[PDB]
Every structure is written in structure tokens, then in C-alpha cells.
Design a protein around this ligand. Structure first.
Ligand SMILES: [Zn+2]
Lengths: 163, 416, 198, 52
RNA sequence: UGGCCAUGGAAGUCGGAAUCCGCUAAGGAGUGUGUAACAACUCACCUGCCGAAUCAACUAGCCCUGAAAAUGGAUGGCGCU
């Protein structure tokens, strides 16, 4: 990759985001794609295959190029997994009104969300992570018919289970 | 709604494309078109006589089919009580097609847009040339007619001749028969005259502007007596409207009787507008090539790639273009691919064996590319611009660059 | 705001003083938030880092509270850009951990030089670019096929010398970062006894 | 072309200035009000437009 | 944390519904610069020095800006601080 055209190993990563379906406007390859042996249409098809059947409401795309074989993965964002665990799935084209229903409970499902966080946050364990992910939700609005804000203060669960 | 109009336009384009293909026998088809002002009784009479004339056509197959076509159109016209606005278009016939299927067919429709063209024709095919011409020429022009008696404002599509608004005025006399008062009366006369110009200009702003941006692509001032001159060279006339003033026309007559005159004299200047917009567009495209920039792109292999990626701002195409989008498909493995092929590469091509597997890769039928551009340029960046081969820059673009390219939103690198 | 917070800040420092009988006074200096986050991640389990003001001038109020002497010795040393590190493990080990962490942070143009900085003989990693920036002061650089190669191992800046602007920028372009430090240790508090990094 | 520190030195004197919205007066960049009695010490100030 | 709507691009930043938690010493799901979009830069909380008042928004007096005419010119004139 430096002087002319050489693969010594090539386990090269770059971060794309968004990818519900193929996308006509694409913008997947160019710049980084062709130089480095990853093509365009085939790379788009591989990206669709990995990010197919959930998530279809936006995804994340780390692209580990093994010479010519890209390894697309879905690294979890908090709002994306909330939108995945909503009332699915009216995918695309109505739709339309809009994607902000936001009354889908998730009480013990967010415990899995705080566990799947890649350490991060500089936390004092889940006790504080619960407060974070209970407010990441712009849409969800917490349990059954609750608010977010100050109900978070009185948590009585999952302090010792999340490590 | 604008989107609903665009859908109706596309539906009618599709309808016209299906009718052009049709074909049949002898002179069985009945291309009929009616203009909006026309009476239906008059057309019904005409068709009845045409039915009478057909009643001695020596041939068998032709005669009977034509009678039944004329019978059907007469019945269609009975269903209407007036010719609807936009005119009427009626296409009767007895089409041949695959499976030896000699099927009768009747398509009357109120077309989108007012059309000014009458037509009666019988032939083996349907005559959808007038419609295609109205679909092409979307450039509306405006027409202000000034006169000391009274003004007129109107519009003008390729065919159609509109009247938007008009008034008359009780202007004062030329002379004042007092020595001292001659001067004052003269100044009063010039003020009244300026207030008329001011009133005309205000009415033009009301009419020809649409959402603080002029709807008409041109604007003809006509009349006499250096009055239309006063309107063009004046600070009262708004600059956004004034900037598109294309002609000052010296006519005789005033009002509707002169409106048509003004059009006839202005016809040459109006047709040249599209040609000028092309020169400006392609001239802007070729600027990028003259400098380094690297915004520009050209050719299906590059321009489409640019379009897919970091999109184009403007995509420029020749009207005619040969190039066609085929859909290639595999027999066994169910693998597929789409490619954009030239007239020689599409007609016969041994390339399309699957090779890796070892099968014949069948090319399932095309959709033509420029149509393809029209379908989903909204999907990509946008501003699909068709250009002719007439201008010297345009001819370069067609002959040299292959009649396809685009001006890009930012700088882009390419390889291979 | 800023009455209840001020009271809450007093409660934070007193609780930390009650919990831990040992504190490490560290100078912040030219430091980043990224640095402080990295230090938090490294020293998460044992130590707790804090950054204060003249309401650390308030150890007096802790000493007032029907109990403590020895905190009287710590009052003069809360000057300059100072932060605390409360902890219970040990003293000499924690000093070694603080010294071992650190960060690069590129040249400060104008400030003093701690060590004898050098420029090894190597390519810059560029095309036919300005060699004149390097050769202006007194460096031997050639365009050895495209890349700007420095042709000798030379000392630009010595100990206790002021770093010029143009030479600082060239070092930043080369990605040479000997200047800055991270954080310094001035004084210590260990169960009443005071040490001076010894 | 021109040495960067030298350039910014010249800029300080010709470019980094406030300008009065009423009278166009060229003012020091700290300015809140105008100098000029002709505009009544306006306080409508804007920055001098930078060369792109 | 490419947060959501918006894909034409807004990961703080053409716009708009939002709009909280963590770390917290503390930083708005962001004042702007600017970007296709970032980046990069810029705009709290806290210190170090210095050493008592500091600062904001209104309001009303005098004064000034606003305030351009044709014979040379009039607080009555001279003049007057
Ligand atoms: Zn001024």
C-alpha cells in the first residue's frame, strides 16, 4: 500500500455508518474502496448481506478488509438497539408518520444493552450506566407509561449482575 | 400538487410510448385530437361524414375496421357534453400484436396542459407527434402588450395562446390650450402616464411572479409609441422580472388583436431561449475542463460511478442517447448483473457467457438509459439537463465527450 | 446553582479526606482532558483523582473538625495549578505509577527544554515540499528522490534552552514529541508524615 | 511569497479591525462603540471582511 | 454518540422536534468560523499572578448624531462659556 501496489498482510479497518438496505445514493466505496482492492457493487452486496434482516432502521459498518474480502460487523449504538427493540417492523415507504411511536417498555432488555457496551464510560458499574442508557432513548420513554428524568434515581436492580 | 402533476405527466408519457408502438392494418387507426375551445357537435358531425365516406371503401378488412373505429369515437364523444379544458385527445383503432391478437382499442383522455392543436388522421399507426412536442416544450413565456388605449398580459406555450389579464384607461389629451397652463398640464399628463406604467408593472409582478421567483422563462413587451420602452427602461419595473425581458416588439393594433401579431414577430427570439440556456450550461461545464478543478466528469463508465458516489450537482445528457441499460441473468446459479451498453455492444455480444461457472449468461431485456436517468435522477443529486447538438459547445459535448457528463458538487479523483 | 454545588464540593473533599489517610499532590501543568481520562482509566480501582481551587484551602475546616492536626503542613503547598490524588495502597509504588504513565504532547514554542532534543537522519514523509523551513536555521536536508531526507543526527535544542517557533513547527510536522511531560509530583501526604519525592 | 509571522504582523495593522455600520469607520478590533461623532458613537459594528 | 428527524449532506454546527445521563472540576446532544461531511479552530467550571469594588438592564436631564436650498444674514444686534 505505500510505494506502488503491495499486500504484506492487509487487515485494514475503516468506519462507515448507516446501511438499512443497498442504498442507491450508496457512497460506500470510492476514495478508500478501489485503491486497496475492494471493488464497489460486490462490496455493497456484502454490506447488504451482513446488515440485512435487522437492522433495517439504520446500522453501523466497520469494514475490516482482508485483502479483497471485507468483514462487515454491526457494532451496537444505544439508540439503534432501542429502535431495533421497538414495535417492528414497518421498514420503508410508509413508515412516513414517522419512527417516533416510543412506548415499548424495555426494563430488563436495557440490562443487556448496558452489558454489551464495550466497557467505556469511565463508570462505577451498571448503577450509573442504567442512568445513561435510560436517557439515550429520545423515542422509547422508558417503562410501560413512564417518563425518563428522575425515576432513574430510585433503581433497585442489576448492580452486581452486569460485570 | 406538484408531485401529483409529475405522476400524471409520467403516466401520459408511458401511455404515448405504448400507443407509438401499436401499429395495425391499412388505415384502421383514428388519431383524433380536439382543441379546448372547440364544439363537440361540430366534431360529431365531422366523424359522421367520415363514416359516410368510409362506407364506400373498396377494401374489406380496412373498411369495416374503420367504420367500427369511427363508431366508437362517436360514442366516446356522446359521453362528453363539452370538450373539456386542455382539449380532448381520442385514439381509436384495431391494433395487431403478438399471439395474432387483433384487438380493438379506444383511448380518450383530457390531456395534462392546454393544447391548441386540432387533428384528424387515419393511418396504420397512431400519430402521437403533437403530444410529444407539448411534453418537450415546457418553457412558458409571458407577454405584456402596452398601449395608450389599454394593456394586456398573457402567456404562451409552444402551441397554446393564453390571456391572463387586461385593462383599458381614460388617459388625457395630448395638448393644453393655455400658455401658462400648457406647462402644468404637460407635467400632469406625464405623471398620469407614469402612473399607468407603474400600474402595469405592478400587475406584471402580481401575475408573472410565483413565490418571489418568475414562473415564465421569457417576457415579451409589445405595443407602440415608446411605451413598452418606458416599461423596460424604468426603475418601477422590478429587476427580477426585468432581467428576463427578451424582446421589445413594435406592433400595430392593441389588445388581443395585436397579441397574436406580437407572438409572430417574437417567435424567432422565443425559440432561441432553449439554445442559449444550453450554451450557458455546457459553457459552464467546459469551464471546469479548461481550468484544473476536477469537478467535471464524462462517459457512462465514469459519470454513473460519480453519480452513485459523492453525487453530481448537474447531470448533462444528449437527447437522443443510444446507450442502454440491460439486465443480464444466469440460468443455473441465479447470479445477475446490469451494464450500460452502446448500440454495437448491445446488438450482438459474445462476452455474456458466465465463464467462472461455464454457462450462457442470458441478457434479459433493456430499459433505455436516458429514460433511466429521467426515472431516478431525484434519487441522485438531481437537475437532469438534456441538451441538443446545435451549439458549438453542444456539438463538442455530443461528438467529443459522447453526449453525457456532469458538473460535480465537490472535487473528485478517478482511476483506470 | 453555585451555593448548593459549593456545599456539595465541600462534602466531596471532606469525605475523601475521611476515607483515605494518604494523599498525593500532583501538579496539573499543560494537561489535556484526554490525559485526565486516560489517568482515570489506569488508576480506577485504587486511587481517586481530584482537581481543586481555594476551596481546597479548606483542609483548615477539616482540621477544625474536633480531631485532626498534620493537615496544617499541607496549606502552603496548594499553590500553582494543583490537583489531588487520594488513595490507600502505598507511596513509592504510586509515585512510580505516576511517573510511568505520562504522555507525549508536542513542542511548546517559547518554553524551556527539559532534555537535549535531537533530529535523527530520516525522511519526513512528503513529496517535493519546502526544504527551506528546515535549512533556515542550520539543518542538512536533501531531496533524495521526492522525500525530504535529513542527512545527519544533529542536536537542535539543549537543556535549559528556549524553543524557537519555526523549529517547534518542524518538530510537530516530523511527529517528534520530547517536550511537555504529563503531570509532576511536588509533595506527598502519608498518614501525617510529609515527603518530598524521596 | 511572504513569511507567515511577518504577514500576520502586517494583518494586525490592516485586517484585524472593526468597522462601523453607520459611517464605515475603521476601528480597533476590541471596539464596542464607534469613534466617530458623525454617527453618534453608533455601536452597530461589524468585522472587516477577511480576504478568502 | 454518525444521538434523532432529515440522505442532498448536518456524527454540536443549511433548517426543525428534541434535548437527558456519565465522567464529573466540567464542557451545550452546542455560540460561531468553516466544511459536501468531518477535521481543525473558536465560544463554561476551575485555578496562577495581580489587589477593591465590580457588573447588568432599564429610566430620565443637559449635550451630540439623526439634520439637505438656492442674493449675504440674523437668540433684534454686538457679543456671551
Ligand atoms: Zn460610525
Amino acid at each position: 500500500m505505500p510505494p506502488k501496489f503491495d499486500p504484506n498482510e492487509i487487515k485494514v479497518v475503516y468506519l462507515r455508518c448507516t446501511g438499512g438496505e443497498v442504498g442507491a445514493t450508496s457512497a460506500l466505496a470510492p476514495k478508500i474502496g478501489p485503491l486497496g482492492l475492494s471493488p464497489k457493487k460486490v462490496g455493497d452486496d456484502i454490506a447488504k448481506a451482513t446488515g440485512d434482516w435487522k437492522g433495517l432502521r439504520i446500522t453501523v459498518k466497520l469494514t475490516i478488509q482482508n485483502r479483497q474480502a471485507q468483514i462487515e460487523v454491526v457494532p451496537s449504538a444505544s439508540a439503534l438497539i432501542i429502535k431495533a427493540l421497538k414495535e417492528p417492523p414497518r421498514d420503508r415507504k410508509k413508515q412516513k408518520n414517522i419512527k417516533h411511536s416510543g412506548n415499548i417498555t424495555f426494563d430488563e432488555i436495557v440490562n443487556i444493552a448496558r452489558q454489551m457496551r464495550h466497557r467505556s464510560l469511565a463508570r462505577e458499574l451498571s448503577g450509573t450506566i442504567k442512568e445513561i442508557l435510560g436517557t439515550a432513548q429520545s423515542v422509547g420513554c422508558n417503562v410501560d407509561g413512564r417518563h425518563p428524568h428522575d425515576i432513574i434515581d430510585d433503581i433497585n436492580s442489576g448492580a452486581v449482575e452486569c460485570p | 400538487s406538484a408531485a401529483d402533476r409529475n405522476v400524471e405527466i409520467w403516466k401520459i408519457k408511458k401511455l404515448i410510448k405504448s400507443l407509438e408502438a401499436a401499429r395495425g392494418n391499412g388505415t384502421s387507426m383514428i388519431s383524433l385530437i380536439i382543441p379546448p375551445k372547440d364544439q363537440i357537435s361540430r366534431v360529431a358531425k365531422m366523424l359522421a361524414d367520415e363514416f359516410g365516406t368510409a362506407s364506400n371503401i373498396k377494401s374489406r378488412v380496412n373498411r369495416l375496421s374503420v367504420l367500427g373505429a369511427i363508431t366508437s369515437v362517436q360514442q366516446r364523444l356522446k359521453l362528453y357534453n363539452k370538450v373539456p379544458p386542455n382539449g380532448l385527445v381520442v385514439y381509436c383503432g384495431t391494433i395487431v400484436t403478438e399471439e395474432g391478437k387483433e384487438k380493438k382499442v379506444n383511448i380518450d383522455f383530457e390531456p395534462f396542459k392546454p393544447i391548441n392543436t386540432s387533428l384528424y388522421l387515419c393511418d396504420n399507426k397512431f400519430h402521437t407527434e403533437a403530444l410529444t412536442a407539448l411534453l418537450s416544450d415546457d418553457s412558458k413565456f409571458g407577454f405584456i402588450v402596452i398601449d395608450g388605449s389599454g394593456a394586456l398580459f398573457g402567456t404562451l406555450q409552444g402551441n397554446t395562446r393564453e390571456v391572463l389579464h387586461k385593462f383599458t384607461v381614460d388617459l388625457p389629451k395630448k395638448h393644453g390650450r393655455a400658455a401658462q397652463s400648457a406647462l402644468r398640464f404637460a407635467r400632469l399628463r406625464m405623471e398620469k402616464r407614469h402612473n399607468y406604467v407603474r400600474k402595469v408593472a405592478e400587475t406584471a409582478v402580481q401575475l408573472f411572479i410565483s413565490g418571489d421567483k418568475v414562473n415564465v422563462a421569457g417576457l415579451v413587451l409589445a405595443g407602440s409609441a415608446d411605451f413598452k420602452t418606458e416599461l423596460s427602461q424604468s426603475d418601477m419595473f422590478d429587476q427580477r422580472l426585468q432581467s428576463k425581458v427578451l424582446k421589445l416588439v413594435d406592433i400595430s393594433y392593441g389588445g388581443e388583436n395585436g397579441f397574436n401579431q406580437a407572438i409572430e414577430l417574437s417567435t424567432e427570439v422565443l425559440s432561441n431561449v432553449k439554445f442559449i440556456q444550453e450554451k450557458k450550461l455546457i459553457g459552464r461545464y467546459f469551464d471546469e475542463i479548461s481550468q484544473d478543478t476536477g469537478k467535471y466528469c464524462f462517459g457512462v463508465e465514469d459519470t454513473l460511478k460519480a453519480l452513485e458516489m459523492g453525487a453530481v450537482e448537474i447531470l448533462i445528457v444528449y437527447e437522443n442517447l443510444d446507450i442502454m441499460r440491460y439486465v443480464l441473468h444466469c440460468q443455473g446459479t441465479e447470479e445477475e448483473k446490469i451494464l450500460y451498453l452502446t448500440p454495437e455492444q448491445e446488438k450482438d455480444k459474445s462476452h455474456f457467457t458466465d465463464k467462472e461457472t461455464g454457462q450462457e449468461h442470458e441478457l434479459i431485456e433493456s430499459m433505455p438509459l436516458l429514460e433511466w436517468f429521467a426515472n431516478n435522477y431525484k434519487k441522485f443529486g438531481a437537475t437532469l439537463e438534456i441538451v441538443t447538438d446545435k451549439s458549438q459547445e453542444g456539438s463538442q459535448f455530443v461528438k467529443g465527450f459522447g453526449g453525457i457528463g456532469g458538473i460535480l458538487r465537490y472535487r473528485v479523483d478517478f482511476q483506470g | 446553582d453555585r451555593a448548593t454545588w459549593k456545599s456539595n464540593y465541600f462534602l466531596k473533599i471532606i469525605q475523601l479526606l475521611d476515607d483515605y489517610p494518604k494523599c498525593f499532590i500532583v501538579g496539573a501543568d499543560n494537561v489535556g482532558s484526554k490525559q485526565m481520562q486516560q489517568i482515570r482509566m489506569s488508576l480506577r480501582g485504587k486511587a481517586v483523582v481530584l482537581m481543586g481551587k481555594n476551596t481546597m484551602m479548606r483542609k483548615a475546616i477539616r482540621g477544625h473538625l474536633e480531631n485532626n492536626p498534620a493537615l496544617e503542613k499541607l496549606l502552603p503547598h496548594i499553590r500553582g495549578n494543583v490537583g489531588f490524588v487520594f488513595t490507600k495502597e502505598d507511596l513509592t509504588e504510586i509515585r512510580d505509577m505516576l511517573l510511568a504513565n505520562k504522555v507525549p504532547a508536542a513542542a511548546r514554542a517559547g518554553a524551556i527544554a527539559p532534555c537535549e532534543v535531537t533530529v535523527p537522519a530520516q525522511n519526513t514523509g512528503l513529496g517535493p515540499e519546502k526544504t527551506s523551513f528546515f535549512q533556515a536555521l542550520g539543518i542538512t536536508t536533501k531531496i533524495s528522490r521526492g522525500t525530504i531526507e535529513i542527512l545527519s543526527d544533529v542536536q537542535l535544542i539543549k537543556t535549559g534552552d528556549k524553543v524557537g517557533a519555526s523549529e517547534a513547527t518542524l518538530l510537530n510536522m516530523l511527529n517528534i514529541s520530547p517536550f511537555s511531560f504529563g503531570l509532576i509530583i511536588q509533595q506527598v501526604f502519608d498518614n501525617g508524615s510529609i515527603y518530598n519525592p524521596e | 511569497i511572504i513569511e507567515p509571522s511577518l504577514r500576520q504582523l502586517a494583518q494586525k495593522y490592516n485586517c484585524d479591525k472593526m468597522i462601523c455600520r453607520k459611517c464605515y469607520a475603521r476601528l480597533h478590533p476590541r471596539a464596542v462603540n464607534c469613534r466617530k461623532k458623525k454617527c453618534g458613537h453608533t455601536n452597530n459594528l461589524r468585522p472587516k471582511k477577511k480576504v478568502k
